[PDB]
């Protein structure tokens, strides 16, 4: 049961012994470029650190085994990090994104705690036995804030300080210690921001700070050393090591620094996801980002309706909620060049086209179960038949409308021609039609056809130049498309009649659009905007979000109605067909086949030759 | 009519001035009886003892920038999340007024810096209000000698520690300075800047083109190449050099000045621009130049978009046609930058497209084959008006070059501090965050600090040092001026010139290629620079050995070397002796003591009660800390208690070796001088009396206060006595340091013994200074023939071995020439006649690199015996007799002008210029004059085979003007208050130090009929209304 | 009978024959050359092209063997020499002899 001192310096997490104060060894870790915030766990003797050059937070034991990245997306530059050894949680403060967030110890169930009016949080300290989390801010007005470990009751604890760092709690004396970089001193205070006392002065830049027994340790970048002193008086001043320049964070490694208890206990407080400590040693059950707490106030629920907007190397998700919750990045690996997106509301899998790999890949929302559906070929846009469970995707290299199952089993080609150039495509299985843009030169067309390639007809051909995106909404019975050359967004009924222009101003490069309730969202790559127009016409064009580079596609997802889906005839056993099952207007259900096959005499299976 | 007998008597006058009045015969016996130690060294041991010194000076200096690197390296990995979010400034702060250390400016330096605002300042996230002060103050306190510390961010805020006010008259843009351009992009740029005047470019539109063309040249470095071209019906480059019309010349200080005056000298023409021929010549220049080590090549074009009448896109065809053929012939290495000169709309939107296609080299638009299989370097295009910042737009062309992520320290050559002080040497290294650039850090140090161990080398009397680099540029050599005195030095000087000597180019090979080594060579005595002749230790030699030992300065691109003349002959230095001071030691700082009955001796604080002693900057363990830091009364007492310390209890307060030993060996002059003063009859003729040593000791009587930076080892009387061992050396007339005006000096060397009387065995010289008219008062009293008439047609005169007259009937004149005291201006006919006597007059051309000039001077044969009379000229109208004064370097001569004769020697009365700086003739008479340069700024050699043994060894020695102060000038009288107007005849006023014999009235040439003696303040040079020589 | 010019300064100037004594009481071309060569720096600096022609017309005057008449030259050679060279002569130690004033 020995206490050491862990500190970070460049790419090294170096360890100093406090008894035989001579052992200087480094923690056996590889791949670290720059180490920053430090904290550990008393249960399994893990060491946790933040890497602000790789934008990751990684974890491992004291031997380098089980080296893993628990937080790897959505980080800018976080040097605030602390461990909840009781509730088995992780908190961190990111300065670039201005967010104090939360997740489990393995990196799952990511939730944002503080995202409003937060100006660069840094040093983070935790008091889980009492239910408080303390952190520092610089920026405009440097101050030290207080809040519960769930994001509520945020208060300004110490208003008049300089740029502070190295926030450490002495859990025995009920006091809070911190350094000050502008007034050049180290000072203390009780657990509620007052009774402030300066311990030592004339430190031109005390960056790090920690506490153990009657001794506080700090590092000053001017003196290039780690020092020890009496925690309350400042006497008995000794040097631990010299020639150590620019330590990013120091930490006392001992089991008494992480004692106490709370009501989360060993059963996670019987919460489904997160156990977040609140006053009176109590707890509340937290939920990941965009999840809501149910009525029982112990279980969480995923969002039933939400929107997905993608970038070149990142897929995002935002909800319209009255909490005004922020959007998050979906932890999907190997995202390279996403061109278009679509979502399956049944098995909760997100699909996309990576134009640098020429692949159609799928994965869960949390990143697991990554699978390549299609892998020369050059996909461009996709639209999912969520009923029959099969995908329509257009290939720009062969200029065909090709059909592929969700598992990757090829079905066949339903549309091909010498002059045809199918690009954007959206399906409407509720009525048995598919819509697609036909980008023939100097004669662009918007056509439609049945789900097998026959019954082809041209809907609109005039008034078009570069129809680059397509979408529809079966409830409203409307077809929407954006023109990046004429700079306008238009509308029309699902039969070709009632063609109107919804907006033709302040449009530059609309590469995507979708319908969410009575709102038409679209994305502008050049203007870097997500905006919306009310279809009812009572409200005006409203800005949603700015500062989003490399926009590609957007897709809204409504909750899947259990009764409406199963009452579709092709939903069960694909309607008994071997390939294509399409709804016909006369109320009956008919099987069909691609263009290189013929429907056999049983009117269920297909044949060749 | 005799002349030899008059020379024996006038020579006994010289010995009485040296033996009795100065004490040479006594001090030669005192140093003859002292015991010395001996060394025989080939330079192998001394080279690594001195390489041991400066290598640790560079290691501590590299450990500052490697520190300040890991400072800023950690100052982004932390400040990507711990930024400033604050604002400060570099002015509006009225304390300071300290001028401490090298920072001779207002400087608080209470661990606080400042932030100089650029124009491209926004929000972003960088240096935390320079919270770096935490470490910056530690750096300044823990490493004395360093000067400035600064950080120029990529954003543009210029932050420097410590804080001072340095040109708040505009904006201090550092990203467009030569410091920050050659550091982030250390590769050599081959730039040509093409200017567009003509096609009726307006004057405000031309004013932007000439201001921006002068921001580019003020931002590059000499390892680059530049050639600016003008284009208007014809292409004419700078018409000020030969290789400007052929090659690209490096961008030194001399090329920047010529190329910028060729700017603003061009005014708007009217013919069509003629674009295509302007680019075809810029490639013909880049082609002819060498590649020489990593090179990028760029062309900048400053136009407004010019068309003709029916050749608007046809001449556009011809421009992008030669861009494909010429740049394709160069493997597409050239990059093209274009800047538009728009104002009010004179340049439309279509002429912007013509300057777009030039930067991108968009040749396929105008139908060109473009058979260049290799891609083209895509250039940029920027717009300008009279409101744009020309430092952040045109000055930032270097961001368009490939950044190869070079992370190596770059060492700069000395340059003037842009912050309001003298000379600086700066090393800088870029700063990377993975692949994101941050800016650079830089540590400024005084040039005198880096070189203090090689500029003040006083170990052996047989050796001297010099510092070089890889390609041979001399950073220091005894032929250069001390770094502390300079204003802007010409570093562009190879050692093949300073150490020019036959068979030196063979040793120059092994020094630049081998890390270390040693080597001896044999050189004849004649055809050798003086530094080797002043250190010979065998009498009567025809050739001599020299040993060179060199070694690289580790972890940098510099090389040190030790020169030892005659390594086999033992060199002696004074053994440690401990004589008790018979007369107590008085340090020369009389302003800090004030205890003696003080008085004023010319422009000096002095005393007549006891002589003083001086320690030059070279005597201390740290010469820079003695020159920059003030010297307090406490420092004088530690030095006085240690120099006269007969015991060995007082520790060394900061002196070198052999410093206290040469003070205890020369303390015997205090008894000689005080005894002679009271029994001498020349108390009113001698202005002072002094002795000097090579290790920096200077004893003077009357003991006077001198400037701290005064070095007697660099004066002419000292350098002239060592060249003539044992002989009495007459030096002058020369301007005295103590403000005594023009004086004449008798100097003589004293040796370790007497069995060995060579130049190298000189351990000290003695000197005694007289007045200008004294030696003409001696000729009239000693030699009766001179008084036959009043110095009109029968004139007597004394000449030194350089041609100057220390005694002459006429004194001072149309207030000119400058070299008026030379024989060529006062006696023209003798000069033409003595140039014809063979083996007696030698004209010398030495090369002085200090002020980039070549000096002319005469050297008379000091070993002549017998008379010299008229041989060809002056056979009728002007008889002459010239002979040598025995045992000295002076000559006595008489002229008998019996009939008028007209003779001329060209001597400038406005400058010093020679008439003809093309050739030099032996028989062409002209007073000592100069010629600028005989080199070429193209290859770096001598135009003619001017491998003369040169090195005039500065010998210019920039005369200062250190006065005293008002209010104290009138509170004291003259020391020797020799009341002037109580002297009656000319024989009693000539030679008195603060008097002068007034012969001319206050109006030119009016002989006043009552010549009286007066304080010299009244009548200067004889005219009672004449103005000051100063 | 005239003798040919022997001073190297005044050879190949337009005429070959001169006769001593001249205007400055020089008895031989040897003695006349010793003074005129004191102007040799001015001739090689090329201030006025008329300088060698003007100076040599003074020290080594034209001699015709059986002519012996005083046919005059032309003052224009005197005032072109002093036009371009006098500002440079006064700059250094040179000064015109009074026997060479452009009025004679
Ligand atoms: C990359 C590749 O070959 N993919 C094949 C494709 O060629 C073929 O059309 C399809 C069914 O025939 O199966 C898949
Ligand atoms: C700290 O200072 C107090 C002064 O009141 C002293 O009593 C105590 O022993 C000190 N602690 C240590 C560890 O020296
Ligand atoms: C909701 O939370 C409260 C805590 O204030 C708890 O008492 C209550 O039981 C929860 N709701 C239900 C339905 O249990
Ligand atoms: C359509 O499907 C496969 C993938 O399932 C695709 O690779 C191929 O190019 C197409 N094949 C046919 C027969 O159309
Ligand atoms: C002195 O210089 C002359 C110059 O020609 C040379 O011939 C002679 O050898 C030199 N004397 C030596 C080398 O002893
Ligand atoms: C050069 O040195 C050698 C010994 O190394 C010596 O014998 C010779 O006399 C010297 N030559 C000189 C001094 O000219
Ligand atoms: C010049 O001096 C040298 C040696 O110093 C001597 O040999 C020579 O004879 C001297 N010439 C005359 C003309 O005195
Ligand atoms: C020297 O000058 C004197 C007077 O000026 C004169 O009497 C004497 O004849 C001269 N000597 C000559 C001409 O040899
Ligand atoms: C000039 O001298 C250098 C040696 O410093 C030499 O390399 C170069 O060739 C010379 N230039 C010529 C000979 O044109």
Short mmCIF file of N, CA and C in Angstrom, two decimals, chain B residues 364-438:
data_model
loop_
_atom_site.label_atom_id
_atom_site.label_comp_id
_atom_site.label_asym_id
_atom_site.label_seq_id
_atom_site.Cartn_x
_atom_site.Cartn_y
_atom_site.Cartn_z
N UNK B 364 -3.31 26.48 -71.34
CA UNK B 364 -4.22 25.76 -72.20
C UNK B 364 -5.41 26.57 -72.67
N UNK B 365 -5.71 27.68 -72.00
CA UNK B 365 -6.85 28.50 -72.41
C UNK B 365 -6.58 29.19 -73.74
N UNK B 366 -5.35 29.66 -73.96
CA UNK B 366 -4.99 30.36 -75.19
C UNK B 366 -4.38 29.43 -76.24
N UNK B 367 -4.73 28.14 -76.21
CA UNK B 367 -4.31 27.21 -77.24
C UNK B 367 -2.81 27.01 -77.35
N UNK B 368 -2.21 26.41 -76.33
CA UNK B 368 -0.78 26.12 -76.35
C UNK B 368 -0.60 24.61 -76.20
N UNK B 369 0.33 23.99 -76.95
CA UNK B 369 0.54 22.54 -76.78
C UNK B 369 0.76 22.11 -75.34
N UNK B 370 1.61 22.83 -74.60
CA UNK B 370 1.91 22.53 -73.20
C UNK B 370 2.37 21.07 -73.05
N UNK B 371 3.51 20.79 -73.68
CA UNK B 371 4.15 19.47 -73.62
C UNK B 371 5.00 19.30 -72.36
N UNK B 372 4.60 19.92 -71.25
CA UNK B 372 5.29 19.78 -69.97
C UNK B 372 4.60 18.69 -69.17
N UNK B 373 5.14 17.47 -69.23
CA UNK B 373 4.53 16.33 -68.55
C UNK B 373 4.46 16.52 -67.04
N UNK B 374 5.31 17.38 -66.48
CA UNK B 374 5.37 17.71 -65.06
C UNK B 374 4.42 18.85 -64.73
N UNK B 375 3.70 18.77 -63.60
CA UNK B 375 2.76 19.85 -63.25
C UNK B 375 3.45 21.18 -62.99
N UNK B 376 2.66 22.21 -62.74
CA UNK B 376 3.15 23.57 -62.55
C UNK B 376 2.84 24.01 -61.13
N UNK B 377 3.73 24.83 -60.57
CA UNK B 377 3.58 25.31 -59.20
C UNK B 377 2.55 26.43 -59.22
N UNK B 378 1.41 26.18 -58.57
CA UNK B 378 0.28 27.11 -58.60
C UNK B 378 0.58 28.34 -57.74
N UNK B 379 0.63 29.51 -58.38
CA UNK B 379 0.86 30.75 -57.68
C UNK B 379 -0.43 31.41 -57.20
N UNK B 380 -0.26 32.50 -56.47
CA UNK B 380 -1.36 33.27 -55.91
C UNK B 380 -1.45 34.64 -56.58
N UNK B 381 -2.62 35.27 -56.42
CA UNK B 381 -2.87 36.61 -56.94
C UNK B 381 -3.58 37.41 -55.86
N UNK B 382 -3.06 38.60 -55.56
CA UNK B 382 -3.61 39.47 -54.53
C UNK B 382 -3.80 40.87 -55.08
N UNK B 383 -4.76 41.59 -54.50
CA UNK B 383 -5.13 42.93 -54.95
C UNK B 383 -4.58 43.96 -53.98
N UNK B 384 -4.27 45.15 -54.50
CA UNK B 384 -3.66 46.21 -53.71
C UNK B 384 -4.30 47.55 -54.03
N UNK B 385 -4.33 48.41 -53.02
CA UNK B 385 -4.66 49.82 -53.18
C UNK B 385 -3.83 50.61 -52.17
N UNK B 386 -4.02 51.93 -52.13
CA UNK B 386 -3.20 52.72 -51.21
C UNK B 386 -3.63 52.55 -49.76
N UNK B 387 -4.62 51.70 -49.49
CA UNK B 387 -5.04 51.39 -48.12
C UNK B 387 -4.57 50.02 -47.65
N UNK B 388 -4.23 49.12 -48.57
CA UNK B 388 -3.78 47.79 -48.18
C UNK B 388 -2.46 47.87 -47.42
N UNK B 389 -2.28 46.94 -46.49
CA UNK B 389 -1.02 46.82 -45.75
C UNK B 389 -0.01 46.12 -46.65
N UNK B 390 1.03 46.84 -47.07
CA UNK B 390 2.03 46.28 -47.96
C UNK B 390 2.99 45.33 -47.26
N UNK B 391 2.98 45.28 -45.93
CA UNK B 391 3.80 44.32 -45.21
C UNK B 391 3.12 42.97 -45.04
N UNK B 392 1.79 42.94 -44.96
CA UNK B 392 1.05 41.71 -44.74
C UNK B 392 0.51 41.08 -46.02
N UNK B 393 0.53 41.81 -47.14
CA UNK B 393 0.10 41.25 -48.42
C UNK B 393 1.28 40.92 -49.32
N UNK B 394 2.07 41.92 -49.69
CA UNK B 394 3.24 41.68 -50.53
C UNK B 394 4.37 41.06 -49.71
N UNK B 395 4.52 41.50 -48.45
CA UNK B 395 5.54 40.94 -47.59
C UNK B 395 5.32 39.48 -47.24
N UNK B 396 4.09 38.99 -47.37
CA UNK B 396 3.76 37.61 -47.06
C UNK B 396 3.73 36.72 -48.30
N UNK B 397 4.59 37.00 -49.28
CA UNK B 397 4.69 36.12 -50.44
C UNK B 397 5.37 34.81 -50.09
N UNK B 398 6.13 34.77 -48.99
CA UNK B 398 6.87 33.57 -48.62
C UNK B 398 5.97 32.44 -48.14
N UNK B 399 4.73 32.74 -47.75
CA UNK B 399 3.80 31.69 -47.39
C UNK B 399 3.38 30.85 -48.59
N UNK B 400 3.63 31.35 -49.80
CA UNK B 400 3.29 30.64 -51.03
C UNK B 400 4.34 29.60 -51.43
N UNK B 401 5.47 29.53 -50.71
CA UNK B 401 6.56 28.61 -51.01
C UNK B 401 6.37 27.29 -50.26
N UNK B 402 6.89 26.19 -50.79
CA UNK B 402 6.79 24.91 -50.09
C UNK B 402 7.53 24.95 -48.76
N UNK B 403 6.83 24.57 -47.69
CA UNK B 403 7.40 24.49 -46.35
C UNK B 403 7.81 23.04 -46.11
N UNK B 404 9.12 22.79 -46.05
CA UNK B 404 9.66 21.44 -45.95
C UNK B 404 9.88 20.99 -44.50
N UNK B 405 9.29 21.70 -43.53
CA UNK B 405 9.32 21.29 -42.13
C UNK B 405 10.75 21.16 -41.61
N UNK B 406 11.60 22.12 -41.96
CA UNK B 406 12.99 22.11 -41.51
C UNK B 406 13.04 22.63 -40.08
N UNK B 407 13.50 21.78 -39.16
CA UNK B 407 13.58 22.09 -37.74
C UNK B 407 15.05 22.11 -37.34
N UNK B 408 15.75 23.17 -37.73
CA UNK B 408 17.16 23.34 -37.42
C UNK B 408 17.44 24.80 -37.08
N UNK B 409 18.30 25.01 -36.09
CA UNK B 409 18.67 26.36 -35.69
C UNK B 409 19.43 27.05 -36.82
N UNK B 410 19.10 28.32 -37.05
CA UNK B 410 19.76 29.13 -38.07
C UNK B 410 20.47 30.28 -37.37
N UNK B 411 21.72 30.51 -37.75
CA UNK B 411 22.55 31.54 -37.15
C UNK B 411 22.66 32.72 -38.10
N UNK B 412 22.37 33.91 -37.60
CA UNK B 412 22.40 35.12 -38.40
C UNK B 412 23.72 35.86 -38.22
N UNK B 413 24.10 36.61 -39.25
CA UNK B 413 25.27 37.46 -39.17
C UNK B 413 24.91 38.77 -38.47
N UNK B 414 25.89 39.45 -37.88
CA UNK B 414 25.59 40.67 -37.11
C UNK B 414 24.85 41.71 -37.92
N UNK B 415 23.88 42.36 -37.27
CA UNK B 415 23.10 43.42 -37.88
C UNK B 415 22.66 44.39 -36.79
N UNK B 416 22.23 45.57 -37.22
CA UNK B 416 21.82 46.61 -36.28
C UNK B 416 20.48 46.26 -35.64
N UNK B 417 20.40 46.45 -34.33
CA UNK B 417 19.17 46.15 -33.60
C UNK B 417 18.04 47.06 -34.05
N UNK B 418 16.95 46.45 -34.53
CA UNK B 418 15.78 47.19 -34.97
C UNK B 418 15.01 47.81 -33.81
N UNK B 419 15.47 47.65 -32.58
CA UNK B 419 14.74 48.10 -31.40
C UNK B 419 15.38 49.31 -30.73
N UNK B 420 16.41 49.89 -31.34
CA UNK B 420 16.95 51.14 -30.86
C UNK B 420 18.29 51.05 -30.14
N UNK B 421 19.15 50.14 -30.58
CA UNK B 421 20.48 50.03 -29.99
C UNK B 421 21.45 49.54 -31.07
N UNK B 422 22.62 49.08 -30.65
CA UNK B 422 23.70 48.74 -31.56
C UNK B 422 23.57 47.44 -32.31
N UNK B 423 24.58 46.58 -32.20
CA UNK B 423 24.72 45.40 -33.03
C UNK B 423 24.26 44.15 -32.30
N UNK B 424 23.71 43.20 -33.07
CA UNK B 424 23.05 42.02 -32.53
C UNK B 424 23.41 40.81 -33.39
N UNK B 425 23.59 39.66 -32.74
CA UNK B 425 23.64 38.37 -33.41
C UNK B 425 22.49 37.52 -32.88
N UNK B 426 21.64 37.04 -33.79
CA UNK B 426 20.42 36.34 -33.43
C UNK B 426 20.43 34.92 -34.00
N UNK B 427 20.10 33.95 -33.15
CA UNK B 427 19.81 32.59 -33.58
C UNK B 427 18.33 32.33 -33.35
N UNK B 428 17.69 31.66 -34.30
CA UNK B 428 16.26 31.39 -34.24
C UNK B 428 15.98 29.98 -34.74
N UNK B 429 14.87 29.41 -34.26
CA UNK B 429 14.47 28.07 -34.65
C UNK B 429 12.95 28.03 -34.70
N UNK B 430 12.36 27.46 -35.75
CA UNK B 430 10.89 27.41 -35.84
C UNK B 430 10.29 26.50 -34.78
N UNK B 431 8.95 26.50 -34.74
CA UNK B 431 8.20 25.86 -33.67
C UNK B 431 7.01 25.14 -34.28
N UNK B 432 6.95 23.82 -34.12
CA UNK B 432 5.96 22.99 -34.78
C UNK B 432 5.08 22.27 -33.77
N UNK B 433 3.79 22.19 -34.08
CA UNK B 433 2.83 21.34 -33.38
C UNK B 433 2.42 20.25 -34.36
N UNK B 434 3.10 19.11 -34.29
CA UNK B 434 2.90 18.05 -35.27
C UNK B 434 3.22 18.53 -36.68
N UNK B 435 2.24 19.17 -37.33
CA UNK B 435 2.45 19.78 -38.63
C UNK B 435 1.87 21.19 -38.70
N UNK B 436 1.45 21.76 -37.58
CA UNK B 436 0.93 23.12 -37.52
C UNK B 436 2.05 24.06 -37.09
N UNK B 437 2.30 25.08 -37.91
CA UNK B 437 3.34 26.05 -37.59
C UNK B 437 2.81 27.11 -36.63
N UNK B 438 3.68 27.56 -35.73
CA UNK B 438 3.32 28.50 -34.68
C UNK B 438 3.94 29.88 -34.86
#
